[PDB]
DNA sequence: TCGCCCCCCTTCGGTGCTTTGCACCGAAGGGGGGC
């Protein structure tokens, strides 16, 4: 085998990201992991001249009750050079969110058989971290395509297609989009039939070397009204803030109506009845919050980018865009884990399920806009991950003005 | 001996080259120590002589080892440090004794001549380049480069940490039931043999060592309790911390003070209740090192409160892993916290504190919070898991604050223990408008231009008011437009504000702040019954808020 | 007149916001401790 020749961004340095503390449990399952990889050459073991690092920890699915070793690639990924540029990039098929049925596949371990530019390895380097600090950090890197980093698909671009090519043949309706480290497979058919043709899959690839998502039920929640019998100052202070807050994203949007119903200085629980042309102009404000808004397409040259906002009592609405107001999609999510009693479990589930969503519909996940401090959000979020890419994220405190999207 | 284990390679920064930096001078008493040791060193192939055609120069310095009678030789080599490569350092963190398990036989190792031992990459040694200025006038120094790793150069602690490693391996692998603690060229080596069978198990190690030319002198060969390990006295069952003296002054300097909180924050890991917060206020708004600084009542107080706990004789025990792992935290006052660590009631594992204000506006429910993950943090880093904690909250308070505060958050497995005084929400504020309660419709504005704004409210009972404020901002004029709604109004009141800002501090019901105003605020909101406060878009002449925008201009 | 590591407390300065100050956060100053 021949390598690519793979270069970082001009003027850009390797990630030196630090090893953060690892469980008991982690840190055992990456030495078990790291020592099998190095016996096979995957991995070589490193001293301390080469100045890069890349955080590593362990994940592991409920339904598959193996550990699965996550280096969190992110820094090295937007170092490295483009592969659009180099002419090695993958395209997004259009019909993966038309299907009723996507199944998710790790086919992580396909690039474990092409090695990496020699040049390009030292920037791979991760350190496994030591109980109570009984030893020095332990430094590997690697010697193939690693999991988890933008450069393995698309240096793999050529081999999955031949590998799939006979699959996508005997099957013209089953649709599959790689992402990373994983394939997204989708099909019409029939749920349990639709599971037979994934093992067929499972089957076709080992020849060489997740759970059913269903984009025909993912539905768009838009801003809705109040309504009422009898309505109060109050009332109509948070309906005029709302309208006049949701006239930066549509079109036309009155509150003069409204707003003069409010003339004085008058209590808040004061009741005040609607004239007829405020309730028109009401009626007429909800029919445009009722059907979507014109003259917003996704653009591929852009970022994608979420905010999630927590509702309550396992409710947490969503709104994914790429420029400010002009909203591809906005969403709801509900937790269902049966305890009902873990803010960061269920965000951190939030931010895969949106995330898979951005997958199966654009192609890329979006940068998220996470509503947690910092802190909380680096302590526990690693014990509910399960996806084998990470999403870009930032922290935002951001107080609720208006209850805008519930 | 210098170990036969192959060198690493390393290089400069690209672009740079090699210092030249000339020798002080030194005292007499010092030459000879530095001649004794490269004289000896040259003998035992440490340092080459070298000659003009070797540009490169750097100083060299000794200072007493902790043996009092050897000298340890230096090289100031910033200059060269500044050039070399970085380096991904291995040394993660400091082992602590909380994490030890009980073992039958202990013993505690020291290389000698550590990292002289490890040899330098040979393309290298010619930046190493010193001199010995052996009475400077006299004659002109003698120079030398290094052979092996020089103590003060950037790499030679993680090259040396890497090379132990490797020669600790094959030994770790063939004894995994042998808990060996590396630190820097410091062993910790535990077992549940036998001592005979323990005793024959360091032979071996050390004899391994030596194939590699690590020695292990006797002098450092600790094979009996209490053993000194990292600042601690390791007995059986329990260890201690080594004496902690604290400053003792008529007359404090400013960097008295620092060194005293400093000692305390060490003392912090087993003394349980120490704290610094009143000491290290004197530290605020300093500007030298030999500034005097008089001691506050309150530091006076806290310190004298410091100081009885450090009278009592305290020590921890070690980790037994089929137990578990609980925190217990107690509030101290003005954002301060400490915490315990035990398995069993009454043995504490170790103590510690948690005392940082972050953000300008935060309440106690927050704080521990970020108590609750310092000590998560901590243990996994000590015991690779996670401690059931015990929290002065009640579960009403935590479950009234995560369903109100807008972010996500969260504490793991607690257990509410009640030692006051509990941690609790000061306030709340009503989700609907207060029933027969006044409404008070805020507004506040500055010219940016000027110092100059106004505060003031319009009320639907007919009552108005504006107040000009001088050296002012925008954000501060809509804080006093609320601070005097609440001053004005009963026990029950519903305010109206246009100021996003203003409503995003009060909704997470801070219960302290940095700020003079907010905190005045704070006091007002806890006096209040019931409070209800909404947002409205401003300019929008909307109700009342267009009528008090009116009033305030 | 040095090096590398962890910790805390204070200070400073860069970032981005539908801002004009403000909150956030990483880095660097001081201190403790280890070899
Ligand atoms: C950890 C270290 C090794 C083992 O530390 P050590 O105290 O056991 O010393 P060493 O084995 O050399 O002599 P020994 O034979 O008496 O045991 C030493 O090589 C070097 C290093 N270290 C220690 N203190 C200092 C210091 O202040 N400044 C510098 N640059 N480096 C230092
Ligand atoms: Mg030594």
């Given at each position: 085998?021949?390598?690519?020749?793979?270069?970082?961004?001009?003027?850009?340095?390797?990630?030196?990201?630090?090893?953060?503390?690892?469980?008991?449990?982690?840190?055992?399952?990456?030495?078990?992991?790291?020592?099998?990889?190095?016996?096979?050459?995957?991995?070589?073991?490193?001293?301390?001249?080469?100045?890069?690092?890349?955080?590593?920890?362990?994940?592991?699915?409920?339904?598959?009750?193996?550990?699965?070793?996550?280096?969190?690639?992110?820094?090295?990924?937007?170092?490295?050079?483009?592969?659009?540029?180099?002419?090695?990039?993958?395209?997004?098929?259009?019909?993966?969110?038309?299907?009723?049925?996507?199944?998710?596949?790790?086919?992580?371990?396909?690039?474990?058989?092409?090695?990496?530019?020699?040049?390009?390895?030292?920037?791979?380097?991760?350190?496994?971290?030591?109980?109570?600090?009984?030893?020095?950090?332990?430094?590997?890197?690697?010697?193939?395509?690693?999991?988890?980093?933008?450069?393995?698909?698309?240096?793999?671009?050529?081999?999955?297609?031949?590998?799939?090519?006979?699959?996508?043949?005997?099957?013209?309706?089953?649709?599959?989009?790689?992402?990373?480290?994983?394939?997204?497979?989708?099909?019409?058919?029939?749920?349990?039939?639709?599971?037979?043709?994934?093992?067929?899959?499972?089957?076709?690839?080992?020849?060489?070397?997740?759970?059913?998502?269903?984009?025909?039920?993912?539905?768009?929640?838009?801003?809705?009204?109040?309504?009422?019998?009898?309505?109060?100052?109050?009332?109509?202070?948070?309906?005029?803030?709302?309208?006049?807050?949701?006239?930066?994203?549509?079109?036309?949007?009155?509150?003069?109506?409204?707003?003069?119903?409010?003339?004085?200085?008058?209590?808040?629980?004061?009741?005040?009845?609607?004239?007829?042309?405020?309730?028109?102009?009401?009626?007429?404000?909800?029919?445009?919050?009722?059907?979507?808004?014109?003259?917003?397409?996704?653009?591929?040259?852009?970022?994608?980018?979420?905010?999630?906002?927590?509702?309550?009592?396992?409710?947490?609405?969503?709104?994914?865009?790429?420029?400010?107001?002009?909203?591809?999609?906005?969403?709801?999510?509900?937790?269902?884990?049966?305890?009902?009693?873990?803010?960061?479990?269920?965000?951190?589930?939030?931010?895969?399920?949106?995330?898979?969503?951005?997958?199966?519909?654009?192609?890329?996940?979006?940068?998220?806009?996470?509503?947690?401090?910092?802190?909380?959000?680096?302590?526990?979020?690693?014990?509910?991950?399960?996806?084998?890419?990470?999403?870009?994220?930032?922290?935002?405190?951001?107080?609720?003005?208006?209850?805008?999207?519930? | 001996?210098?170990?036969?284990?192959?060198?690493?390679?390393?290089?400069?920064?690209?672009?740079?080259?090699?210092?030249?930096?000339?020798?002080?001078?030194?005292?007499?008493?010092?030459?000879?120590?530095?001649?004794?040791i490269?004289?000896?060193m040259?003998?035992?192939?440490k340092?080459?002589?070298?000659?003009?055609?070797?540009?490169?120069?750097t100083?060299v310095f000794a200072i007493?080892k902790?043996?009092?009678?050897?000298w340890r030789k230096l090289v100031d080599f910033?200059?060269?440090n500044?050039?070399?490569?970085?380096?991904?350092?291995?040394?993660?963190?400091?082992?602590?004794?909380?994490?030890?398990?009980?073992?039958?036989?202990?013993?505690?190792?020291?290389?000698?001549d550590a990292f002289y031992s490890v040899?330098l990459?040979?393309?290298?040694?010619?930046?190493t380049?010193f001199?010995?200025?052996?009475?400077?006038?006299?004659?002109?120094?003698?120079?030398?480069?290094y052979?092996v790793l020089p103590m003060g150069w950037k790499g030679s602690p993680?090259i040396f940490?890497?090379?132990?490693?490797?020669?600790?391996?094959?030994?770790?692998?063939?004894?995994?039931?042998?808990?060996?603690?590396?630190?820097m060229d410091?062993?910790?080596?535990?077992?549940?043999?036998?001592?005979?069978?323990?005793?024959?198990?360091?032979?071996?190690?050390?004899?391994?060592?030596?194939?590699?030319?690590?020695?292990?002198?006797?002098?450092?060969?600790?094979?009996?309790?209490?053993?000194?390990?990292?600042?601690?006295?390791?007995?059986?069952?329990?260890?201690?911390?080594?004496?902690?003296?604290?400053?003792?002054?008529?007359?404090?300097?400013?960097?008295?003070?620092?060194?005293?909180?400093?000692?305390?924050?060490?003392?912090?890991?087993?003394?349980?209740?120490?704290?610094?917060?009143?000491?290290?206020?004197?530290?605020?708004?300093?500007?030298?090192?030999?500034?005097?600084?008089?001691?506050?009542?309150?530091?006076?107080?806290?310190?004298?409160?410091?100081?009885?706990?450090?009278?009592?004789?305290?020590?921890?025990?070690?980790?037994?892993?089929?137990?578990?792992?609980?925190?217990?935290?107690?509030?101290?006052?003005?954002?301060?916290?400490?915490?315990?660590?035990?398995?069993?009631?009454?043995?504490?594992?170790?103590?510690?504190?948690?005392?940082?204000?972050?953000?300008?506006?935060?309440?106690?429910?927050?704080?521990?919070?970020?108590?609750?993950?310092?000590?998560?943090?901590?243990?996994?880093?000590?015991?690779?898991?996670?401690?059931?904690?015990?929290?002065?909250?009640?579960?009403?308070?935590?479950?009234?604050?995560?369903?109100?505060?807008?972010?996500?958050?969260?504490?793991?497995?607690?257990?509410?223990?009640?030692?006051?005084?509990?941690?609790?929400?000061?306030?709340?504020?009503?989700?609907?408008?207060?029933?027969?309660?006044?409404?008070?419709?805020?507004?506040?504005?500055?010219?940016?231009?000027?110092?100059?704004?106004?505060?003031?409210?319009?009320?639907?009972?007919?009552?108005?008011?504006?107040?000009?404020?001088?050296?002012?901002?925008?954000?501060?004029?809509?804080?006093?437009?609320?601070?005097?709604?609440?001053?004005?109004?009963?026990?029950?009141?519903?305010?109206?504000?246009?100021?996003?800002?203003?409503?995003?501090?009060?909704?997470?019901?801070?219960?302290?702040?940095?700020?003079?105003?907010?905190?005045?605020?704070?006091?007002?909101?806890?006096?209040?019954?019931?409070?209800?406060?909404?947002?409205?878009?401003?300019?929008?002449?909307?109700?009342?808020?267009?009528?008090?925008?009116?009033?305030?201009?």
């Amino acid at each position: 085998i021949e390598t690519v020749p793979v270069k970082l961004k001009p003027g850009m340095d390797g990630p030196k990201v630090k090893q953060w503390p690892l469980t008991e449990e982690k840190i055992k399952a990456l030495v078990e992991i790291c020592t099998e990889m190095e016996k096979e050459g995957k991995i070589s073991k490193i001293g301390p001249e080469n100045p890069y690092n890349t955080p590593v920890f362990a994940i592991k699915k409920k339904d598959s009750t193996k550990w699965r070793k996550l280096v969190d690639f992110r820094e090295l990924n937007k170092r490295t050079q483009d592969f659009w540029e180099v002419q090695l990039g993958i395209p997004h098929p259009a019909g993966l969110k038309q299907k009723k049925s996507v199944t998710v596949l790790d086919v992580g371990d396909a690039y474990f058989s092409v090695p990496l530019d020699k040049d390009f390895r030292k920037y791979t380097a991760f350190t496994i971290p030591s109980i109570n600090n009984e030893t020095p950090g332990i430094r590997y890197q690697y010697n193939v395509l690693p999991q988890g980093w933008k450069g393995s698909p698309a240096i793999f671009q050529s081999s999955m297609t031949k590998i799939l090519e006979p699959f996508r043949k005997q099957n013209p309706d089953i649709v599959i989009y790689q992402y990373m480290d994983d394939l997204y497979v989708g099909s019409d058919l029939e749920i349990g039939q639709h599971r037979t043709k994934i093992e067929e899959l499972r089957q076709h690839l080992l020849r060489w070397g997740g759970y059913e998502l269903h984009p025909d039920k993912w539905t768009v929640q838009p801003i809705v009204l109040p309504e009422k019998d009898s309505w109060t100052v109050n009332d109509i202070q948070k309906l005029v803030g709302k309208l006049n807050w949701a006239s930066q994203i549509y079109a036309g949007i009155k509150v003069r109506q409204l707003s003069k119903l409010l003339r004085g200085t008058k209590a808040l629980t004061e009741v005040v009845p609607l004239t007829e042309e405020a309730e028109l102009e009401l009626a007429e404000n909800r029919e445009i919050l009722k059907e979507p808004v014109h003259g917003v397409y996704y653009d591929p040259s852009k970022d994608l980018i979420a905010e999630i906002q927590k509702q309550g009592q396992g409710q947490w609405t969503y709104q994914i865009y790429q420029e400010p107001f002009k909203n591809l999609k906005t969403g709801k999510y509900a937790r269902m884990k049966g305890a009902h009693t873990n803010d960061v479990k269920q965000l951190t589930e939030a931010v895969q399920k949106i995330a898979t969503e951005s997958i199966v519909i654009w192609g890329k996940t979006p940068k998220f806009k996470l509503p947690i401090q910092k802190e909380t959000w680096e302590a526990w979020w690693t014990e509910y991950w399960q996806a084998t890419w990470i999403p870009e994220w930032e922290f935002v405190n951001t107080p609720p003005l208006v209850k805008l999207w519930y | 001996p210098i170990s036969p284990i192959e060198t690493v390679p390393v290089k400069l920064k690209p672009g740079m080259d090699g210092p030249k930096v000339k020798q002080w001078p030194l005292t007499e008493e010092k030459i000879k120590a530095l001649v004794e040791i490269c004289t000896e060193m040259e003998k035992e192939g440490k340092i080459s002589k070298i000659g003009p055609e070797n540009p490169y120069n750097t100083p060299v310095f000794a200072i007493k080892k902790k043996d009092s009678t050897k000298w340890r030789k230096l090289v100031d080599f910033r200059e060269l440090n500044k050039r070399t490569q970085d380096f991904w350092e291995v040394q993660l963190g400091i082992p602590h004794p909380a994490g030890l398990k009980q073992k039958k036989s202990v013993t505690v190792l020291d290389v000698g001549d550590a990292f002289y031992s490890v040899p330098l990459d040979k393309d290298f040694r010619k930046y190493t380049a010193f001199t010995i200025p052996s009475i400077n006038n006299e004659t002109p120094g003698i120079r030398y480069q290094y052979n092996v790793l020089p103590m003060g150069w950037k790499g030679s602690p993680a090259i040396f940490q890497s090379s132990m490693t490797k020669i600790l391996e094959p030994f770790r692998k063939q004894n995994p039931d042998i808990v060996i603690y590396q630190y820097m060229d410091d062993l910790y080596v535990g077992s549940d043999l036998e001592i005979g069978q323990h005793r024959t198990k360091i032979e071996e190690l050390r004899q391994h060592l030596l194939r590699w030319g690590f020695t292990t002198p006797d002098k450092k060969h600790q094979k009996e309790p209490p053993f000194l390990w990292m600042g601690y006295e390791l007995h059986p069952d329990k260890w201690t911390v080594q004496p902690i003296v604290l400053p003792e002054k008529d007359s404090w300097t400013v960097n008295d003070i620092q060194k005293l909180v400093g000692k305390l924050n060490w003392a912090s890991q087993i003394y349980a209740g120490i704290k610094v917060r009143q000491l290290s206020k004197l530290l605020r708004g300093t500007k030298a090192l030999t500034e005097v600084v008089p001691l506050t009542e309150e530091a006076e107080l806290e310190l004298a409160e410091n100081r009885e706990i450090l009278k009592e004789p305290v020590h921890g025990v070690y980790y037994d892993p089929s137990k578990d792992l609980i925190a217990e935290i107690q509030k101290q006052g003005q954002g301060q916290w400490t915490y315990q660590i035990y398995q069993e009631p009454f043995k504490n594992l170790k103590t510690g504190k948690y005392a940082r204000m972050k953000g300008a506006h935060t309440n106690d429910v927050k704080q521990l919070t970020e108590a609750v993950q310092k000590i998560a943090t901590e243990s996994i880093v000590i015991w690779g898991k996670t401690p059931k904690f015990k929290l002065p909250i009640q579960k009403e308070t935590w479950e009234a604050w995560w369903t109100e505060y807008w972010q996500a958050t969260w504490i793991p497995e607690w257990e509410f223990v009640n030692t006051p005084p509990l941690v609790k929400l000061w306030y709340q504020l009503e989700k609907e408008p207060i029933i027969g309660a006044e409404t008070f419709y805020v507004d506040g504005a500055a010219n940016r231009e000027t110092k100059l704004g106004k505060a003031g409210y319009v009320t639907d009972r007919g009552r108005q008011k504006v107040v000009p404020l001088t050296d002012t901002t925008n954000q501060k004029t809509e804080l006093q437009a609320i601070h005097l709604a609440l001053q004005d109004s009963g026990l029950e009141v519903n305010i109206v504000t246009d100021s996003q800002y203003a409503l995003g501090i009060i909704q997470a019901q801070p219960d302290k702040s940095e700020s003079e105003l907010v905190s005045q605020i704070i006091e007002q909101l806890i006096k209040k019954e019931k409070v209800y406060l909404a947002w409205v878009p401003a300019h929008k002449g909307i109700g009342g808020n267009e009528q008090v925008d009116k009033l305030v201009s």
